[PDB]
Amino acid sequence: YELDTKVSELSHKLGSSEGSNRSLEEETARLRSLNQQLSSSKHELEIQLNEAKAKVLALDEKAQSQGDVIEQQRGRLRDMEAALRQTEQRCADLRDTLASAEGRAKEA
Amino acid sequence: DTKVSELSHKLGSSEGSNRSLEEETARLRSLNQQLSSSKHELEIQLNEAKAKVLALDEKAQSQGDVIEQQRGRLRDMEAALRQTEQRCADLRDTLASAEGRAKEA
Amino acid sequence: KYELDTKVSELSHKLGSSEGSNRSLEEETARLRSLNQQLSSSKHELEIQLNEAKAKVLALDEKAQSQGDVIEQQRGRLRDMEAALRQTEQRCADLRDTLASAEGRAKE
Amino acid sequence: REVKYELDTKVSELSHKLGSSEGSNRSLEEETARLRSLNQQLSSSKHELEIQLNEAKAKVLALDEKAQSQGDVIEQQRGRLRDMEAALRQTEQRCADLRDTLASAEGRAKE
């Protein structure tokens, strides 16, 4: 009788153990799948971030050079504007002198 | 007996699977909670963003309007400047001639 | 000797309870898994849509900053030219007065 | 008797089949543990990578808008520089012509 009882509790504990085993196998399968998906996403995001940071470097380079050109050409513009102001001044003076000489010639 | 033992076994596996199922149902319910909340948040941010796009597009049209209008005004102003400058040059010549006439007499 | 009959009957009963329970739970896990795949799908879709929308917002806003800078610059040039025009008009009027003087006292 | 002999054999086999099953269970529990670890740090890494990617994308949009704006300004500036080079050349030439007409006029005034 005692051996029958021990056979019984043993068969029960065994059944529970095997059922827990199928649980754990199913769960490791699920977990491996999800890990592969997540590592794939991580790798993809890594590639995209590297690309984006590179584009940041390139565009920052281009922008800085562009800024220096804008400043350079702003200076060139002020210098030109001044050169033209002065040349125009010389022309106005000449035209005054010419017009005055016309006045005296007609007065003669 | 032999069949209290085979039945003890089948009951053991039954309770084991029962635990596995309860644990998986709990995990799933929690995950649906997470994804549902996440999806509601995404919806909020998406509607906010769509609204912002419409507003910003509108303002882009307004700003583009005033930029064009101001371009046209700058062109008109350059024109009026050119014409006035020319008038001044003509006046200055008439004057200079009158001053030569004065200096001769 | 009758403890056999009571024990076996007890165990068969515990089985039909544990397995009503079980097949019910299996139903719930299948249903929940379905709702999940649909939620992950819709979440993914919303992620694509939101990312496009966020990019559009950002680009629009940056171009608005740019347009504002252009507006302010234009108004500055416009005011500078307002002053320049007013000054040139005043110069012409001055030359007109001076002209009336030179004529007036040349006639003298 | 012989029956107790069979029962002993059955208790033995059940005991060691059980022991084996528990061994498998502890191993699988360890594997499931480390797997949930990797899951957690992979997903956390993913969240962080998303945040960083979003910030970098925004920086690209700002930088690109800057480069296009500066492009327009550069082209407009070059335009006004061209026009002004031409206008300066023409004004210098016009001044030279004025000086020449001046010389000839004064020469005529002495006649």
Residue numbers in the entry:
A (entry chain A): 7 to 114
B (entry chain C): 10 to 114
C (entry chain B): 6 to 113
D (entry chain D): 3 to 113
What does the paper say about this structure?
In contrast, structures of the CrSAS-6_CCMiddle fragment, resolved from two different crystal forms, revealed parallel complexes featuring extensive interaction interfaces between coiled-coil domains, within each crystal’s asymmetric unit. In CrSAS-6_CCMiddle crystal form I, resolved to 2.34 Å using SeMet-derived experimental phasing two copies of the coiled-coil domain in the asymmetric unit interacted over almost their entire ∼16 nm length. In crystallographic structures of the CrSAS-6 coiled coil, we showed that these domains form a unit equivalent to two cartwheel spokes merging together. They do so by associating into a parallel coiled-coil complex, the formation of which does not perturb canonical domain structure; for example, the coiled coils do not unwind or adopt a tetrameric coiled-coil arrangement. Rather, complex formation relies on ionic and hydrogen-bonding interactions interspersed along the length of the coiled coils, and is very weak in solution. In contrast to this prediction, however, reconstitution assays with CrSAS-6LD produced abundant cartwheels, similar to those generated using the corresponding WT protein. We surmised that amino acid substitutions that remove favorable interactions of the symmetric CrSAS-6 coiled-coil complex do not affect cartwheel formation in vitro.
The spindle assembly abnormal protein 6 (SAS-6) self-assembles into 9-fold radially symmetric ring-shaped oligomers that stack via an unknown mechanism to form the cartwheel. SAS-6 proteins comprise a globular “head” domain at their N-terminus followed by a long coiled coil that mediates stable protein homo-dimerization (Keller et al., 2014), and a disordered C-terminal extension. The characteristic shape of the SAS-6 ring led to the proposal that the protein head domains comprise the central “hub” of the centriolar cartwheel, with SAS-6 coiled coils forming the cartwheel “spokes” (Cottee et al., 2015; Kitagawa et al., 2011; van Breugel et al., 2011; van Breugel et al., 2014; Yoshiba et al., 2019).
